[PDB]
Each structure stands twice: as structure tokens, then as C-alpha cells.
Symmetry: D2
Subunit: 431 residues, 4 copies
Amino acid sequence: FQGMKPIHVGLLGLGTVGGGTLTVLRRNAEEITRRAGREIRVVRAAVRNLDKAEALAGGLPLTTNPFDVVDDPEIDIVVELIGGLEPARELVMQAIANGKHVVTANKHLVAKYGNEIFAAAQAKGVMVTFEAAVAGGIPIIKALREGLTANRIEWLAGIINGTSNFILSEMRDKGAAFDDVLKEAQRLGYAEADPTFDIEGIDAAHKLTILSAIAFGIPMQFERAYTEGISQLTREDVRYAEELGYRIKLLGIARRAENGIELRVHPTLIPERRLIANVDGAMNAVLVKGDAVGPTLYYGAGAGSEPTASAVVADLVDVTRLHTADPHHRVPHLAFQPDQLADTPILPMEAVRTAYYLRLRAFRPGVLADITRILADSSISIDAMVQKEQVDIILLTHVTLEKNVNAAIAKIEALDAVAGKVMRIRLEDLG
Amino acid sequence: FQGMKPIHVGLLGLGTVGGGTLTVLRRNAEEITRRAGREIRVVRAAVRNLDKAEALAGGLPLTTNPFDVVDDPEIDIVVELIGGLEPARELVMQAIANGKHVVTANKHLVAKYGNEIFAAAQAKGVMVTFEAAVAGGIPIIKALREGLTANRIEWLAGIINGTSNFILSEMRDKGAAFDDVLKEAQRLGYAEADPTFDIEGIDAAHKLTILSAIAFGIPMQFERAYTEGISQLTREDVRYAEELGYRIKLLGIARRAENGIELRVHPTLIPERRLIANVDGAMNAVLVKGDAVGPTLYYGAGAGSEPTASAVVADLVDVTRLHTADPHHRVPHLAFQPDQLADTPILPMEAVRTAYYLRLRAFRPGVLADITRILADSSISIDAMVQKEQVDIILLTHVTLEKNVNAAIAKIEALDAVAGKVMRIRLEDLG
Amino acid sequence: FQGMKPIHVGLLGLGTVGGGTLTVLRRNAEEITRRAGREIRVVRAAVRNLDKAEALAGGLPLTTNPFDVVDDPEIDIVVELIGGLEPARELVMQAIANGKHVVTANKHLVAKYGNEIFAAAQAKGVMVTFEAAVAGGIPIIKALREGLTANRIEWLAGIINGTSNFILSEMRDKGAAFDDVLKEAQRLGYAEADPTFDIEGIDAAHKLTILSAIAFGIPMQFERAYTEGISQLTREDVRYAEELGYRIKLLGIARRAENGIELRVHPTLIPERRLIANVDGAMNAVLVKGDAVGPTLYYGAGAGSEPTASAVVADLVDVTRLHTADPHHRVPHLAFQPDQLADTPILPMEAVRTAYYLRLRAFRPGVLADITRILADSSISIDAMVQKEQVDIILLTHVTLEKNVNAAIAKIEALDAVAGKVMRIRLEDLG
Amino acid sequence: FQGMKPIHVGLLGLGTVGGGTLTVLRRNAEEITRRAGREIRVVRAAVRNLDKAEALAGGLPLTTNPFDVVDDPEIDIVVELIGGLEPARELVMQAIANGKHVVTANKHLVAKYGNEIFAAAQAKGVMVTFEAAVAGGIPIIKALREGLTANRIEWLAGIINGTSNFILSEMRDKGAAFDDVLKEAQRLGYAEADPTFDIEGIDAAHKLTILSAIAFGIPMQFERAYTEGISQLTREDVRYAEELGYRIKLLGIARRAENGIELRVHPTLIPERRLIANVDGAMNAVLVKGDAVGPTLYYGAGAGSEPTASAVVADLVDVTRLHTADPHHRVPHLAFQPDQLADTPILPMEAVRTAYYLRLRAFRPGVLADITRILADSSISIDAMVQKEQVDIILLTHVTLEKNVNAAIAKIEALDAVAGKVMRIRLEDLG
């Protein structure tokens, strides 16, 4: 008979997400078995800290040797929840060498080594899945890879890092400085003691790289992504943006341009009318533009215990279904297809077109005349200017090639009348 | 070799969506073949009007006999785009009898005859899919059935009829009467000459029934759905709701309650802060609450040529993959599972708990005293009242059993001081 | 010749206003002499503290004996700037006994002893003037007594205490508690160490009494004025009033009612659209309703050095003109006319009609039913109610006789479900 | 005895104001007699149309010969209500030649011939008064001449034409074009069939000239006043001003500048926070800045039957008091003093400093560069710019000498890229 042999799952790492995963599998067992066609049974977890893992494990057998999982011939699927590059990279490659599928939440590993991992998986005939790696419990990979298969994806924009969104939301709502919002976030447990990956846009850029690979059918190319974080943003910027009709978000943009693909993470002004502009707190959202369907939006929690577990288990079900149905690979199994890739190049940030919020400090009437002539020389059109013995002057530009703005900014900063730098923050309509 | 035999598709009906489907299949052929594992090839379309179909067909062979499609042994998948109950019901059943899969956009047929259709499909071992039947190009069925498989769904709320949303959006923005917004919508082609299914909530209730079946694993039970449309709504109501902090939408709610399932379509006040409250024009959105993932939202176009085609083709790909991989049914194929159903009863509207906007016309100081005593007698708590020789009095109630409100309203309407009826409109926080 | 003999002025008290007066007389000497028809020359000031007075006097002779001023046969006009009741009352009466005119800023003295003072002045044939006693530099007495002589005054409403207005403005703008706004005001010198007369409405009620005497031609009847201050007002009250469409001001109202005259000072909600509702900081405004002219408004500073001096000097000019023109009293000289008085009674507060903001704390659905029945029993109509295990409930009533509200409040406070008192604050449309 | 001989008054013209005057004198007879010291008795009215005058006269004797009034030896005071220049000028001069006082509402006559009229009045020893000529029932002349006598007036700004304010209020509230607001105003009787004096700022400039004479002690110099009306103002202008934080009013400004006096009427942007900016409908307001008192504001109706009558009667009382007290002129009687005048010159508009709203239509990025260089060349500083194949560009300038703006505008209009003219509207903070 079919449906009587359980599929056997092993975990690498446990933690919050692992504990969540065990809880979700047990609690929803009935529905999971129904959809999967057989029971999904967790056999053991390899963990570094045995004592801390006990509280989260609910009596699941634990071991400190990860090869008790990746080399156990009885284990069919490995769930990788270690995070980091090593030893996750080594264990994942070994799991694959042994003919095991891998379900992972590891956006860092997948963004950096996805090409080599998927290539090795396809050669071996196993699946590696990563729904839980991007936007938490939001089924965005399934939406992109399966829901929107009939679409050419023109672009997507995402709020996909909860901590940096929480900070930017709090700054706007409360009016406080970045520094003390970051400190308050750490105290209340919204930001970790070392928040570099969050506030510098690195986490978001890992995830965007993955989204870009699946949206456009290209290799993972994290090194080529432009990233800028939020730490240089001031109270004034948030307030001026508000008065000008915009919200500020840390956005990942992946977009087909004329001569390449944009892959960029940066603070960006979004008109306040847009739904994505009003996605606050620790919530995530991905806005996707397909040629047939138009803009579609997926919104929810992008991190946290049970939301992440939800995506891990969905991947467990998907992998289980295809493992059982199709061991001879009559149909493609991998969401990332090494034999179906396009070589479209990623654009440098300077080759990308965008609009700008510009804020500078200057000392005369001739000051504006020089600034505007510099802008015209670089073919930059102004949408608005506001001047709120030095005055703060704010400029909103039309859409323009970034190289132009770089060159123009250097001339403006060369003006005797200009002390300090020109703070740039990019602006995207998304309409 | 695998992948060399095309799957052969036949259409019933063509129209806007059919033309769209042919265009999308041709334009995205490369990606579709990649994901499906073989070419998906449309062989012919059965159409009623040969001349009108010519302009939309792009040279695809046409026939006026639908059995040239459903009885042709070479056709593997039938795409049903007729709409209506008959002859769609008969042709669909015959397609199934002949061992063909069916991809349909027909929410009316699926909501009314889904139980018998899926039962017949499971017995035969074929698939019937209906992604295009609910929320157009938004992959909500895939999200509910596959993305959220690890979740118990607690409730969902949807804006899933584009025309009724367009009218309610226009009324709010422009301040005009329902009558002339409806007329203006018909003139500009946003509403059809007979808009009954749209403005009466029937279309939305077809779709909600389908959503409820997949969310909760229950039979289709359209007859048991509560439905109320928008035609009784006044300019005053939209304006008062705005001043009170709410937007008015035609919402479908499907929810697990204490003793049953709520299945209801009605105008409803939603706090203006909610994302779903700001979903305007012809856009659709479904807000889904799962136990593991929390609230997630799916937003986009819910009708139109290419959005609908997008969902049809996604279903074509899904069906093709499983047809090829798993003809022996090692795993479940149907999104609706006749052998896995729960018998949880649908609640009558009166057994449902909700909050209310109440507006009535009355003539004395004792008038309010009597009204409030009547409410207390039926255990109804007031949140707010506003009195904007007859005065219009507006009441917002706390959450309460509908039976209570029915009885209290009848006593209020019996008061000598009260001329006319008490206009009720329901209120849902969704937070 | 005319115009060659200076009129000789003596001061009682100096201080800020006195110093201001000397400065204004000197600086505008040309215009003052032109209008007066002769020079106005300050001869000396009687002061208590000789050293502190030196800095403000600009070399004007000083004496510590006030009879060097009020008994000097050469002095024609006494300017009384002592404040307080004694010795101002005694010196003023002695100045009058000696046939000298008196210009005073002393609202306390005039409100309490105006009847006896003006009677003594008319018998003697001298003038006592008090422009500087009410609303500082705003020429409201001249406007009421001379500008609006062709009008029956129906009512006036005034913001006439700068300190209490500053506090209420700050509370609204900044959201802070009364306590710390009062403390911050004292630290920055907007409120004096003992602010009783300001925050309790006593100063405003002195001034309103004076305004009422001139508006309606009645005796001064300060004892019969209703007064309530601001110290019981909470942050919640200011915020709720804001959300409901109102601003809160400490208002003096003097009004002809059906059976009497209203004379009342209290916190009051004024619709936010009204100009007087937006009179903030330390500014004063008096809104006057005449039968011929309609509503007229006079706005400006209501205290401070030079604004007060401005009014003192205007009075000096008026007195000088009539002293010179008309020593035989062919025309009336006094602004308050003891031989032309009406005996219209002042209403007790309970006999006055007004609308109310009511805020109470209560524990059930029957709670509102009981409250509303109590209100109907006392013939009180509700405009609005808002309910923002105890809940805060807010009621706006229609216009009603105060006695009714007193009785109804006592029944509401007797309800078991009601803990604490019902905070009342009155509400006036002024439209 | 004093007080037994009535003063005898004759009218020239009757109309709305005349009828009002008779009604007010009769209705308030008690108070008027009290303050005046004797009865004020209207003997007859000279009118052009006997039949139309009957309805307004209440049985007062009427005659068509105005010399039955101005040559009747028994008449002490003439009330001139004809309007226009002739025959009012001739009759007024004849009244003066005959030793009669004149009370007038005729702002046109007083603004144009005030110098010659007051000179003739002072020589004869009679009074000419004109309270009713400016700002209707608001006692602004009394406030300026008597209330603020201790002040050097630095500047005043007035909304003093009801019709032009009604139009500008309606345009802002309703969003309609000037043309149809003007037409609708004429239909509802807010604007007369020939509205030239109202919409062109002529009426306001008559009144401002009078205000300027009394504020600054200078001759009437109407010919030297700058005037601009409202008819060139567009819907866009009102809306852009609103979005930028301003209201648009037709303002009269009289101000002491460095080298002269500003005397100007024009549309002007006032920040929306100012009380005067929110003075809407047919209401008038004069904002007065004195050195001692600071800014003071007088608000009310500036036209209409009984408001105007109110001011006429106040003048009747003033004239009566001084006629009785002081026939030997011990003190000055005239509000305008021909023997006390300063020769300070009126500035041409081009010699005046003000800020600007500038709106122009233009076609390139170099367009803004040229505009800003032109502005810098004329020493003009920009506060803000907004750009809402031609684009509308809006500029707010800092305060600058008008000559500079004229020259800069001519260069901007010379740019090939600029089609049409630069619409200027002036901007005044008034803070």
C-alpha cells in the first residue's frame, strides 16, 4: 500500500524555529498527512547546546554530532536551521551527496552558495527548498514559482527585514532619533545585540538575491547587489518626507531594466498612498509586477517562530509529495533550475535610473542658481525644492540615471557655499 | 523520452478570458514548458458564436459542437470558460466521464455543484481546478491549499467582487448616490447591463463558498451562505462611516465560530487603518488568518482578461505536472478532497456575532431613553451615538449575537416616535 | 490762550505699568498733546519701595507718602496703579474728595467698589476711568461705551485672563498635564508664584463684572458672578474636546437672558471654527453681540507693560479733553452713570441655560439605559455619546437649564455602577 | 437748563442705510439721549425718488430739494448718504459753508476730497465724521483716533470690502471659477450688477486711504495708492495657495517703510494660521500694529443696513456731545487735523518690499537653471518651488523690492521656453 511508510526528517539546529517546527508538525498532523500522502515524522535534531535545546525539543532525541542526521541512511529530508555559512554549507553539501533533500531557512547560505548547492542537488536528483528563507510565513516563493508561472515578472519591491522596518515605523510614528529607536528596540527585543545585518540591509539583500533568482530565472549574484542601510537617516529626513507626501522604507528592488537587472537595497521614499508604504512594525510585504496579472501584493509576518515554521512545513509537504510521486524526475522538482538559466547581467547602481530626495546645508541667492545649473549640466530635472546663517535645502528630482546624480553631487559639494555633504535618499513611485 | 509529447488542451467558450489564455500560453511558452515538463498545446475551442470568436482566436480552430472537445479522445485537459450553470454542468460532467481534467473559471457552477463534481472527479481519478474562479489572478487557492497547509485557518475576509468595490470606492471618493455611481459605472464599462450578481453580493458569495471549502475542508454549501448587497446604502451612510473612522466594503467572511462556521457576504464597516479597508477600485484582496502564520494578505486584480488567463494557465501547469508525474495517484491531486471532509455546520446569520452601525429617524428626550432600554433588554452595549422635526440618530454597538439585534430593532421600530426602519450595516474590526 | 497750561498728573504705585506709562507719555508726547489740546505732564509718583522704583522712574521725583499726590492742590489727575483693595480704595476716595480725576488699572477695586466710587465721583463732578483695568491695551470700554452706543448689547464673551489662556493653549498644543504646564509657566514667568486669581477665574470675573456694567448699564455686582477655574481639567478632557470638534477656554460670559443677566466665568468648550476659539497664548479677545451691528470682535494683548500703559494714556487723553472742554458738565463724563442704572437681576448659575460636556467612569449594558433615563427625567437631550473593568463615558448634551443638570448628575452619581463624580464642563456655540 | 433742546438732524439720501438710521435712532433713543446729553431728532430727508423712499422712511417728511436740508438754519447736523462724488461734494461743502456738521458714509468722496473738505470744516469750526465710511459697524476710526492715541502706528492690514471677500471665500470653499462665483454672487444679491469697485479693489482703496490718513496723520492721497483686483485669479491659484499653507485675501496695506508710506490694495497670500486669514464671507477685519500695544484686531460686518446705521449714530452722538460741550473749540474736534499733518511721501508700488507667489507655464532641465539665474541676478531668493508638454511651475520668493521682481519677470517672459506671462500674487506674513 501507499501512504503507510512515514517520511523521516532530521534537523540541523533547533532554536525558536526548530521548536516551532516540531509544534506545528504535531498540532496540524492531520492536515499535513492528508496533503503529503504519508506521515512526516521528525526522528532527531543535531544541536550544539544540549541543555538549551531540551526546553524546545519536547522530548525529541538530540545529538551533538550532525552526521547522526546527514549520514543516517534512514533520513529522507534534512531541515537546516543553523544559520550562518559554516558549518551549514558543509552539512548541506554532505546531505546532498548522501541523496537527501534539504529544507532550509538559511538566506545567507542560499544567497551566497545557491548556485553550487542547486547544481549539486540537480546532479544528485534531490530537492533543496528555501521558502522559510525569504519573507517568513508569506508563501512568496510558491507565489513566484508556481502562482505566477504564466507571467513575465517585470519587477518586485519588498519590505523583507522586520527589524529595519520596525525602526523606520517607530521613527515616523514617535519622531525620535535613529540611535534611541535602535537602543529601545534592542531593550524590548525587536533588535539583536549586533544588528548589522538588519540596519545595513544585508539580510534584506540576501533575501532579495533569492527573490531575483526565482523571479527572473538567473543565477544567485549577491556580490553584485547594491546595498545601503538606514543608520545615516535623520529625524529631519523622516519629517520632511512626511510633509512632502512620502514614507521611508528599506526596500529591496529587483527589476528588468533596458540593459540589465537592477538588484538593490536602500532606504527609499514611497508615496504615502501606496499599500506597501503603510506596511509597518515588523511586518513584511512583497509587491510583484507580472505582465499578465499586473501588480500583486503579499503581506504578513516575515520572521518569528511559528510563521517561519509554517513555511518550513509547507516545504516539507511539497518535498514529500514529489519525492513520493516522481522519483524518476518526469517533471522538474527544483524551484531554482540550473539547466534553465539566463545570463542577463546585474546593473551597477550607477547604471540604474531612479528619483531622489536631496538635502544639503548651504550659506546667498546665487547658491540656488549654481545648484540648478549644475543639475541641468548633468541633465537632472527638479520636481520640487523647499528651503527649511546656513539653510537646509531640499530637492526632489525627476527620474534620472544615478551616474548623473553622483557627478552633480560632487560639483555641488565643491561649491564654496556648501559645507558638508549632500544626503541622498532614493525615491520610487511603485505605481 | 519524457517531455516530447505535448499535452492537448480544449476550450469550452472563448470570450475575453479565452483570448487572453491563448495569448498568455503563446507569449510565455518558454517558461510554461520549462515548469510543466512538456508543451501545453491548445487544439481547438468550442464556441457558440463563430464570427465573434474569430477576432479573439488568433487562427485557433473553432467548432460549435462542444462534444468535439469533451469527446475527442486526444484531448487531455478541458478549459471551461462558458460561465453559467448549463450547459457548463453537463459538459464538465461528460469531460470527467471521459477521463479528462477540467480547468474552470466558473465560480457559479463550482459553488453550486462542486460537491458532485469533485466526487465524480475523484472516482474517475481526474483533476478539476478552479484558481481562476476566485479573486482572478491572485493565487489564493494555491496560497490556501499549499502555502498555508501547515495552518489551521481561523478566518478569512475578502473583497472579491470588483464592480461592487468600484462603486463603494467611487461613492466614498466622489460623494455621489449609489444610483448614479451605478449608472456611471455601466456607461464606462465597469458594470454590466444586468449587475445583479455584483451589487447583490451573489458573485462574491459564490467565491466565498469556494474559499470556505478549501480553508476549512468542508463541502460547498452556497445555499447556507448569508448574502446582502449594496443597493440600500445611502450617501449619508458612507459619509457618517468616514467621520466615525471606518470604510464601507462588501465583504465575504468565512470564520470558525464556537458552534459553527460563519459564511456571510454583506456591506461592512472596517476601521480605516486596516490595509483591506484601503483596497479600492476594481482590486480584490483576501485577508487570511492562520494559527501559525497570523494574518496574511493577498492583493491584486480579481477579474479582467489577462489576470484571469494567468490563473487558468497556472492551473494548466499544475494539472500537467501531476498528470505526468503521478497517474497512479500516489499523492492526492484534488484541491477539494471528498474523502477528507468535515461536517462542521454553517451558522445562520442570526446565530452569528458582529458589531453594528445603526441609523434611524426619530422625533423628545424620552426617545433615546427608550431606545437604550430596549438595547439593554437585548443585552446590547453601545460604543457611540451621534445625533446628526425628525433627527437622524446613529449608534455603534459592541459585538453582539445577531438574534439580539433583530429583536431589539423590531421593538425600536414599534416605538411611536420612530418613523421608518432602522438601517443596519455590520461592522468588523479584522484586527 | 488755550493749550498752554499743562495738566498735572500724579501716580500711585509705579512698577512695570508705571514705568511703561512714563515711557509712552514721553515717546508719543507730540500726538498726545495734539489730541489732548494741552501737555500731559507727570509731576511725581508715590511708591512703597524707593530703590526698586528708581530703575523704572527715569528721574521722576518719588515720594513714599501718597498724600503728596492725592492732597497736592496742583495735581489734576491721579493714576492709580497700586492694585489690591487697600490702600487703593482709601487713596482713590480721597483723590475724589479733593476734586481730582482718577485713571486706574485696578480691576479688583473697580469690580468690588465701583458703585460707591462712581457715585462719589458723579457727586463731586470728577471722572474715574478704567480702560486699563479690562483686556489691557484693547480699547474695549471705548468700543462698548462709545463705538456701540447705538446698540443694545445682547451678550459678550471674553478671553480676558492671559495666564489661564496660556496654560489652556499649552495643554492643547503640548498634551501635558495642568500641573506641569502651571509649573513650567511659573518658571518661564508667565504665571506668578501665587496664581490663584488667574487659574480660579477671579481676575477674569473682576473684569467681566466691569464689562457687564458698561454693556448693560447695571451696577457692579461681582458677588453675584458665578466663577469656576481650570485646575480640575485633565489631559483627557482637552484631548476628547479636540476629537469632538471643540477648544477649551476660560470664558467670561455676560448675557441678557429671559428673566435676568448671566454673569459667569468657567471653562467652556467652543467649536473649533470660531475665531475666539483660536485665540491662544497670553492674548485676550472680547466678542460682543449688538442688535444693530451683530457680532464684533476685539483682539490683542490683555496684560503687559506697554499695552497697559497704552490704555492708561488713552484714558489720560480722554479725561484731559473733557476736563478742559466741559467743567460745567453740559454732557455726561463718566463711563459708568449712577443716575442712569437698570435694576435687572443677575441670575444664579442654576437658573442659567447652557450645554454640557460630561465625562464619568462607570462599570454592564444597563448602565447607559439608567443614565439616559435619568437624563430624560430631567428633560436633558443628548447630542452625542462616546465610550472611550471601568469605562470612561462622554456625553454632549443639548442646551438645558443648569438646575436640571445638577439634579440629574446627583442621580447618576447615586448609581451603584458609578464610581466617583461626573466631571462637567460647559459648552457654548457663540455662533 | 441743559439737555432740553433737541439737536436737529437732516438726511441727504435715504436708502437701506437711511432707513436703518431712522430705525436705530428710534429703537435705542433712551441710550442715545443718555450719552449725547440731549435728544437727537431727525427732521427730514432729501431724496431723489419720493415713492421708493416712502417704504423706508416711516413717515419722516421727505423733500426732493436738498437745500431744504443744507440751507435750513434750524438743522445742526447733516447726514450724507448719497454716495458718489456729485452732488454729494457740492451739498457737503454748502452744509459746511452754513455752519453745519456732516456725518457721512461716503468713502469715495472722503478719499478723493477729504483734504479740501476737512480744511473747510476746520476753518468754519464744524465737524465732518466718517466712521460709517470704513469697515461698516466696526468702530475702527474711534479705535485708531482715540483708543490708540498713545501709539505710533507701524502698519495696518484690512479686509474691508465684503463682496470681494465673499467671492474669495466661496472660491476657496467650493473650488469654482471666479466667473461663476461672481455670477452666483450677483444672483443671490451679494454683488451688484456693476461690481467694478468691489472686484477691482477701488472700494477697498477708498477706505484704506482714509485709514492711512488717520493712522499716520497724513493728507488723503488716493491717487497715489496702488490697487489691483481679483478678476485675474484662477482656481489653480486658490488650490496651490491652500496646499502651500496660505489663504488668498484682497488686502489693503498701509505701512511706514524706511523712505515712505506703503498704500496698496492687492490679492495677497496670508499664512493660514493668522486670524485675519480666516475672516470669511462678507465680514471685514482690520489688523492694527501699534508700538505700545502690539497687534490688535477689529472684526465684524463691514457693510449692511443696521451695521452702517450703527456707525452713523455713534458719529451723531460724538458730534452732538462736542457741539454742546465745546462750541469755542478748547479741544480739537476733527478726527482729521489739517493743522497737524505730516508730509511723509507715499511709495510707488515698485519701491515697496514684499514676497511673491509666482506661477508660470514653461516647456527642458535648463529652463529652471535660467529662471533661477535670472532671479539671482535681480537678487531674488527663493523659498520654495513646485512643478505641478508644458509644465506649471510655482515659485515662492523671499521678501524683495518690487522693482527687482518686475525686471526679473520680464527676463523670464523673454525666455524662448516660456509661453505666456508670469502670474504674480503678493504674499504677506502679517506676523
